[PDB]
Design a protein around this ligand. Structure first.
Ligand SMILES: [Mg+2]
Ligand SMILES: [Mg+2]
Ligand SMILES: [Mg+2]
Ligand SMILES: [Mg+2]
Ligand SMILES: [Mg+2]
Ligand SMILES: [Mg+2]
Ligand SMILES: [Mg+2]
Ligand SMILES: [Mg+2]
Ligand SMILES: [Mg+2]
Ligand SMILES: [Mg+2]
Ligand SMILES: [Mg+2]
Ligand SMILES: [Mg+2]
Ligand SMILES: [Mg+2]
Ligand SMILES: [Mg+2]
Ligand SMILES: [Mg+2]
Ligand SMILES: [Mg+2]
Ligand SMILES: [Mg+2]
Ligand SMILES: [Mg+2]
Ligand SMILES: [Mg+2]
Ligand SMILES: [Mg+2]
Ligand SMILES: [Mg+2]
Ligand SMILES: [Mg+2]
Ligand SMILES: [Mg+2]
Ligand SMILES: [Mg+2]
Ligand SMILES: [Mg+2]
Ligand SMILES: [Mg+2]
Ligand SMILES: [Mg+2]
Ligand SMILES: [Mg+2]
Ligand SMILES: [Mg+2]
Ligand SMILES: [Mg+2]
Ligand SMILES: [Mg+2]
Ligand SMILES: [Mg+2]
Ligand SMILES: [Mg+2]
Ligand SMILES: [Mg+2]
Ligand SMILES: [Mg+2]
Ligand SMILES: [Mg+2]
Ligand SMILES: [Mg+2]
Ligand SMILES: [Mg+2]
Ligand SMILES: [Mg+2]
Ligand SMILES: [Mg+2]
Ligand SMILES: [Mg+2]
Ligand SMILES: [Mg+2]
Ligand SMILES: [Mg+2]
Ligand SMILES: [Mg+2]
Ligand SMILES: [Mg+2]
Ligand SMILES: [Mg+2]
Ligand SMILES: [Mg+2]
Ligand SMILES: [Mg+2]
Ligand SMILES: [Mg+2]
Ligand SMILES: [Mg+2]
Ligand SMILES: [Mg+2]
Ligand SMILES: [Mg+2]
Ligand SMILES: [Mg+2]
Ligand SMILES: [Mg+2]
Ligand SMILES: [Mg+2]
Ligand SMILES: [Mg+2]
Ligand SMILES: [Mg+2]
Ligand SMILES: [Mg+2]
Ligand SMILES: [Mg+2]
Ligand SMILES: [Mg+2]
Ligand SMILES: [Mg+2]
Ligand SMILES: [Mg+2]
Ligand SMILES: [Mg+2]
Ligand SMILES: [Mg+2]
Ligand SMILES: [Mg+2]
Ligand SMILES: [Mg+2]
Ligand SMILES: [Mg+2]
Ligand SMILES: [Mg+2]
Ligand SMILES: [Mg+2]
Ligand SMILES: [Mg+2]
Ligand SMILES: [Mg+2]
Lengths: 97, 114, 54, 46
RNA sequence: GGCAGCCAACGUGUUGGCUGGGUAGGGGAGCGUCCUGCAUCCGGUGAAGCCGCCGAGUGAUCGAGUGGUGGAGGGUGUGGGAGUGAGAAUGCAGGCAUGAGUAGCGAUUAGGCAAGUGAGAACCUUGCCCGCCGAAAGACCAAGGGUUCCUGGGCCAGGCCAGUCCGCCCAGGGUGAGUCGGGACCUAAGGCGAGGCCGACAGGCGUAGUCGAUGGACAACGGGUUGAUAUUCCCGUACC
RNA sequence: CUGUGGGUAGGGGUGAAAGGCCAAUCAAACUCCGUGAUAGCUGGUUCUCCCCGAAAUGCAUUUAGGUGCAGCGUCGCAUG
RNA sequence: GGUGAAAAGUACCCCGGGAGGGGAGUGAAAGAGUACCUGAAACCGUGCGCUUACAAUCCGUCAGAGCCCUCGACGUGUCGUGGGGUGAUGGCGUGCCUUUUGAAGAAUGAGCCUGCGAGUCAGGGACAUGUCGCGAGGUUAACCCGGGUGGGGUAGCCGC
């Protein structure tokens, strides 16, 4: 889905626009990711009694991965014929991320 | 104007016109007088409306924090609600319609001066 | 017989008006040192504790 | 005071008058079964 | 004083003269709806729809005048195309009135009180009475039904009222056979029917057969036990 | 009289015969199809304004409450 | 069929047996609360304004007293090129549609609202009339080549 778990992503649209984060879980069939620190919600838990605050998914379009020098990018693919692999490269600087 | 508290009871299984027939007894009265009148009035629709009145009083108890004894039932009415339709079979293969009607009782009480 | 015409709102509301209730006439009684209101019909029965003042 | 209605249930007789085997043995019955299958009935026959 | 139709005059937009009830019907010119080519404009600083205010036009109607509600698309010009206009079809669908808080609440037995439960009890539980059936309104089955049976829970819909109850809702449980009733035994009316004969074809009958109980043959009885099964389980004694 | 099982099917069945009955239907059952049957008959047919504006007679008619042609309306052209 | 961008689907408190609500929170909005976009009419209430219990009313229209609201002016309550609401009272006044010589008709149809429901389409058809192209000529049909609406196609057809 070009954006995975565990890689830093800059949220590119929406209210939290301009925030770095890390994707904690990817929902490929909904085109959505859950990245910590952004798109927080305030949910009522019926009881440990109180009101909770966690994150909610953002559309994967709303976020762009971050480079090796901290610049957001679109990601392309290169072929590593040495192992038949298909590696993710950054379209901006040409190296992996 | 006077400070006011509201209470609504919706989808009560009582015909609106049968709720109004005891609502018309207690409109514009002190809450305690209305509750007494409903408690000794021999129509079943008193059970919902009484509760609604009491509920409104409690709101002024606990959300406006105003004096119990100054409350007057300023506005009270009964709106129609959804109707369920049933069939009663009749003579010679006829089938007549039956309406199970409901109501929404609304009360606003005010804390008027003595 | 069967109604010849649909009946008008004035005439409908004229005898829907008679279908009303009257409020019972209440009097005061003292039970357990505190005052309650009861019909004068039930006055005695409240005075010797046979009506349940909620 | 006769009050006997027309439908008197009987599982065996309903089978032997409307069942699958009787619809199949003839030709109009196979036509009926194929027609009901094409229409989409969940129950082709008694 | 305003409009319009026909005609005339100068002349090229005026003026003047005549005329302007109307069904069937003929002709002419238009209003509003939607979809579209092309052109322009408006719109989250709030489009459409709806509700108003204040107005406008000779009519259908109008409001790039305004507010409220609303939340994403619209206006206008010039052409193109219509599933283009409803008040009547004992019209179709849905929602809702009138009668009207009216009739009815489904036999010919009939209930009462005390106590309990519970937020709430004429209707539920318990006791004591009273009454009705008793060739049944009791007991057991077939056909038919299908889980309605038992236990625990429930009380929104159903129950012609209420319901704490229920043949209603929910979950779990429950149906034990050598002998009972069937098949594995037998055939009747009949059904189908290898080959078969008949018939343009489709098919009709039918032999041998093979099914088909409402009938024939064939070995188990009494007691106890579960909340729910009982010649089935167990106990005692049998039979094939 | 009755239970269980079975047989007869639509111009056909069955009838101690009433045109009775054949699934609450029978002087020819029901379903689907031909099919949107056909009705000189009844009903309905939706916005506006401008100008003009009838007939209910003659003739023929398996005709008489239908239709054809004439008469009588409107629009276009010709004549004046 | 339609909550919202996202369940963030109302923690906790209060009245109530529950159902339902009132605070508090969520949300851009809860005139979005899983009875959920917009939320019309019929139908049903509640509040206020005017009127109505000696009066024969197709329920209107024209004239109209009184009351109530509003816009101006002068001023301080009374006029004005006024505007609304309601209406005591007086004159006139026989629903709509179908179908009929003729119906308010005691002839038909219609309880009410909202949505729906009836002259359309095909064809080198026929006749007439507009409009356009070419014109003693006019035009192609099948077909063929064009990702198109373009170009070829003389067989026929109509006029002569
Ligand atoms: Mg994006
Ligand atoms: Mg009461
Ligand atoms: Mg019946
Ligand atoms: Mg009925
Ligand atoms: Mg009889
Ligand atoms: Mg003139
Ligand atoms: Mg005229
Ligand atoms: Mg005139
Ligand atoms: Mg428009
Ligand atoms: Mg256009
Ligand atoms: Mg724009
Ligand atoms: Mg906004
Ligand atoms: Mg549109
Ligand atoms: Mg606004
Ligand atoms: Mg608007
Ligand atoms: Mg057009
Ligand atoms: Mg239409
Ligand atoms: Mg309509
Ligand atoms: Mg209608
Ligand atoms: Mg209807
Ligand atoms: Mg009613
Ligand atoms: Mg009556
Ligand atoms: Mg009576
Ligand atoms: Mg009665
Ligand atoms: Mg009964
Ligand atoms: Mg008791
Ligand atoms: Mg007896
Ligand atoms: Mg006896
Ligand atoms: Mg019995
Ligand atoms: Mg039971
Ligand atoms: Mg219940
Ligand atoms: Mg009930
Ligand atoms: Mg129970
Ligand atoms: Mg039970
Ligand atoms: Mg044995
Ligand atoms: Mg045989
Ligand atoms: Mg053979
Ligand atoms: Mg045979
Ligand atoms: Mg056998
Ligand atoms: Mg037997
Ligand atoms: Mg038992
Ligand atoms: Mg035993
Ligand atoms: Mg016999
Ligand atoms: Mg049989
Ligand atoms: Mg016969
Ligand atoms: Mg039938
Ligand atoms: Mg019959
Ligand atoms: Mg026949
Ligand atoms: Mg016939
Ligand atoms: Mg035909
Ligand atoms: Mg026809
Ligand atoms: Mg004229
Ligand atoms: Mg003629
Ligand atoms: Mg002519
Ligand atoms: Mg907030
Ligand atoms: Mg909004
Ligand atoms: Mg709703
Ligand atoms: Mg809504
Ligand atoms: Mg008077
Ligand atoms: Mg008179
Ligand atoms: Mg008058
Ligand atoms: Mg008059
Ligand atoms: Mg007639
Ligand atoms: Mg007539
Ligand atoms: Mg006549
Ligand atoms: Mg009439
Ligand atoms: Mg009349
Ligand atoms: Mg007639
Ligand atoms: Mg009628
Ligand atoms: Mg329709
Ligand atoms: Mg054509």
């Amino acid at each position: 889905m070009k954006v995975h778990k565990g890689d830093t992503v800059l949220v590119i649209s929406g209210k939290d626009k301009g925030a770095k984060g890390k994707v904690l879980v990817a929902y490929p069939d909904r085109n959505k990711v859950l990245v910590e620190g952004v798109n927080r919600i305030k949910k009522h838990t019926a009881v440990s009694g109180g009101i909770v605050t966690q994150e909610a998914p953002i559309h994967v379009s709303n976020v762009m991965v971050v480079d090796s020098d901290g610049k957001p990018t679109r990601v392309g693919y290169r072929i590593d014929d040495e192992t038949g692999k298909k590696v993710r490269i950054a379209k901006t600087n040409g190296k992996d991320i | 104007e006077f400070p006011s508290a509201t209470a609504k009871a919706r989808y009560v299984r009582v015909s609106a016109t049968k709720a109004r027939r005891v609502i018309d007894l207690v409109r514009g009265k002190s809450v305690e007088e209305a509750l007494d009148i409903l408690r000794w009035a021999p129509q079943a629709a008193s059970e919902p409306v009484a509760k609604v009145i009491a509920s409104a009083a409690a709101n002024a108890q606990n959300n406006e924090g105003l004096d119990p004894s100054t409350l007057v039932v300023a506005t009270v009415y009964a709106d129609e609600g959804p109707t369920a339709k049933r069939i009663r079979p009749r003579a010679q293969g006829r089938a007549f319609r039956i309406r199970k009607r409901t109501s929404h009782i609304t009360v606003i009480v005010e804390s008027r001066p003595p | 017989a069967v109604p010849k015409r649909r009946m008008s709102r004035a005439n409908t509301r004229s005898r829907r008006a008679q279908w009303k209730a009257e409020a019972p006439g209440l009097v005061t009684v003292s039970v357990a040192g505190q005052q309650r209101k009861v019909p004068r019909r039930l006055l005695k029965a409240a005075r010797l504790g046979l009506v349940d003042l909620d | 005071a006769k009050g006997k209605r027309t439908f008197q249930p009987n599982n065996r007789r309903r089978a032997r008058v409307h069942g699958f085997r009787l619809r199949m043995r003839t030709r109009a019955g196979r036509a009926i079964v194929a027609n009901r299958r094409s229409k989409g009935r969940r129950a082709l026959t008694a």
